[PDB]
């Protein structure tokens, strides 16, 4: 049922420098003892991002631009951002995709949904279970439906520091939406932790919709619905050149963007982290 809230505020806009975010395995190629240079749709280093502090009245999910693909991050204590509407018009007017994790399954469909003006998870706050997926009411002219394998996530309101960091990357290619998953344990007071974390392929999704906007479905919390504490971001994937240092097991252990600063544009020419002292010809201007 398409319902609204009592108050929807704007986030705190707290700025942060994303240090080492967005890295994933592009391919299925194993390589080892190697150092590989590529461009793909990557989140760049040192990127200025904004902190969407969703706290108890603030509810940030308007039309947000996707345009090729996005990076997502979320330090989570209450596991709030667990859904995403993808599409163009964000109304019951074009074909859209509702990807939700409804605490039991990952439910993905590709239809012309009766899209509400408020994408939320109608979840009871003192216990953390979802009453209804109040994002659509029904669907029309579908092309896809899937339910994942079953597990359970505690999504009630929690206090303290953020214990869960989930890393998500969404991309449009050949019909196949590719959604990749990253995770680490954290103990987080403010905007984001610095550090390195990869992503791995999980989903290959022939959804077939014109993917030009996204509305990240949040989780509503009220025992008139509200929310609770979650720090989550929006980043943009750009066709930038990365180095991909592989260890002996084939784990991506480090990466270097070429387009940050003239130090790291030099690294992509030398193909190393170690660069001797001197002058090196790099590409023309």
């Amino acid at each position: 049922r398409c319902t609204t809230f009592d108050d929807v505020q704007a986030p705190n806009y707290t700025q942060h420098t994303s240090s080492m975010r967005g890295v994933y395995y592009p391919d299925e190629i194993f390589r080892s003892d190697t150092l590989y240079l590529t461009q793909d749709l990557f989140l760049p280093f040192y990127s200025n991002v904004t902190g969407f502090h969703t706290i108890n009245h603030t509810f940030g999910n308007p039309v947000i631009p996707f345009k090729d693909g996005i990076y997502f991050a979320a330090t989570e204590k209450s596991n709030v951002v667990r859904g995403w509407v993808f599409g163009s018009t964000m109304n019951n007017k074009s074909q859209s995709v509702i990807i939700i994790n409804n605490s039991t399954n990952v439910v993905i469909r590709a239809c012309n949904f009766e899209l509400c003006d408020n994408p939320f998870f109608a979840v009871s706050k003192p216990m953390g279970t979802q009453t209804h997926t109040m994002i659509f009411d029904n669907a029309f002219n579908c092309t896809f439906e899937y339910i994942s394998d079953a597990f359970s996530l505690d999504v009630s309101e929690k206090s303290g520091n953020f214990k869960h960091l989930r890393e998500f990357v969404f991309k449009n290619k050949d019909g196949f939406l590719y959604v990749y998953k990253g995770y680490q344990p954290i103990d987080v007071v403010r905007d984001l932790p610095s550090g390195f974390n990869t992503l791995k392929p999980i989903f290959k999704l022939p959804l077939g919709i014109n993917i030009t906007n996204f509305r990240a479905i949040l989780t509503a919390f009220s025992p008139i619905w509200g929310t609770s504490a979650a720090a989550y971001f929006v980043g943009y994937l750009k066709p930038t050149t990365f180095m991909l240092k592989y260890d002996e097991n084939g784990t991506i252990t480090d990466a270097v963007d070429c387009s940050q600063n003239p130090l790291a544009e030099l690294k992509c020419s030398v193909k190393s982290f170690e660069i001797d002292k001197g002058i090196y010809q790099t590409s023309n201007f």
Binding site: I29, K93, Q95, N172, G175
Partner: protein
């Protein structure tokens, strides 16, 4: 050169040549922007039934691309185009079918199968009830469907029909019986190529020999033996410090293998002279 000895055909579990009524048996095809999706999965298919029907007449693949099949699911896509828009059903090639109605993937490429429907799907006033997108605020990416049954804003501003100077997203084709071939309705099945495999059998792992091999996404000749490489579960195969694959996770039984090439090299001849002798020894 060492001439190889053996065949290595390794695949996950095998089904038969399945019948596909979505390929050659469907009678009415809907519009192209709302193109009907039916798929093909888990069948060793040749799509000889594209040729083998009395419902089609063109028989062309975009036709050596018919056997272009050892990959994921094929989508037999059902729609009626016009003769001037037969040309735009292509990987890329952004015309009024490809840019806004029906864009095709480009890893592998299937078959576009049209049929003469001058007498059934047309009329002498133009069977205008079939329509197509010609201009939309946003281009399709490959393998997408557009079911916007909506009066359209031609520039992104609130100008929707039935307001003045506000355009519809749908032109008429002009399916006339009184015109030539360029304006005829053509029932088109496209096999969108984006799990089936054409040459899909199962043979023995002829290890430690110069063999041939055909895998899930890997062909070639060489030497096969188990490997110790720490493959990730999301990693199909390995490559060397160069850029040809020398290690593979087995498509049938997941055993991590090595692929060395077959042995080869040069030949010398060591002779002491024809005046000296007539025997030689080769290196």
């Amino acid at each position: 050169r060492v001439v190889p000895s053996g065949d290595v055909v390794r695949f996950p579990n095998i089904t038969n040549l399945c019948p596909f009524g979505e390929v050659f048996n469907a009678t009415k095809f809907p519009s192209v922007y709302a193109w009907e999706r039916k798929k093909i999965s888990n069948c060793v298919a040749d799509y000889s039934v594209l040729y083998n029907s009395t419902f089609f007449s063109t028989f062309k693949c975009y036709a050596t691309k018919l056997n272009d099949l050892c990959f994921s699911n094929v989508y037999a896509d059902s729609f009626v185009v016009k003769g001037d828009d037969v040309r735009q059903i292509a990987p890329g090639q952004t015309g009024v079918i490809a840019d806004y109605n029906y864009k095709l993937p480009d890893d592998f490429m299937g078959c576009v199968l049209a049929w003469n429907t001058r007498n059934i799907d047309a009329t002498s006033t133009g069977n205008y009830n079939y329509k197509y997108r010609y201009l939309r605020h946003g281009k399709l990416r490959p393998f997408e469907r557009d079911i916007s049954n909506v009066p359209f804003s031609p520039d992104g501003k609130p100008c929707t029909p039935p307001a003045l100077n506000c355009y519809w997203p749908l032109n008429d084709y002009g399916f006339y019986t009184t015109t030539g071939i360029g304006y005829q309705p053509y029932r088109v099945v496209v096999l969108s190529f984006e799990t089936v495999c054409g040459p899909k059998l199962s043979t023995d792992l002829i290890k430690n020999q110069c063999v041939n091999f055909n895998f899930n996404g890997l062909t070639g000749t060489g030497v096969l033996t188990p490997s110790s490489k720490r493959f990730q579960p999301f990693q199909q195969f390995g490559r060397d410090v160069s850029d040809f694959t020398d290690s593979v996770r087995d498509p049938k039984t997941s055993e991590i293998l090595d692929i060395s090439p077959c042995a080869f090299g040069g030949v010398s001849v060591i002779t002491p002279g024809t005046n000296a002798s007539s025997e030689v020894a080769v290196l």
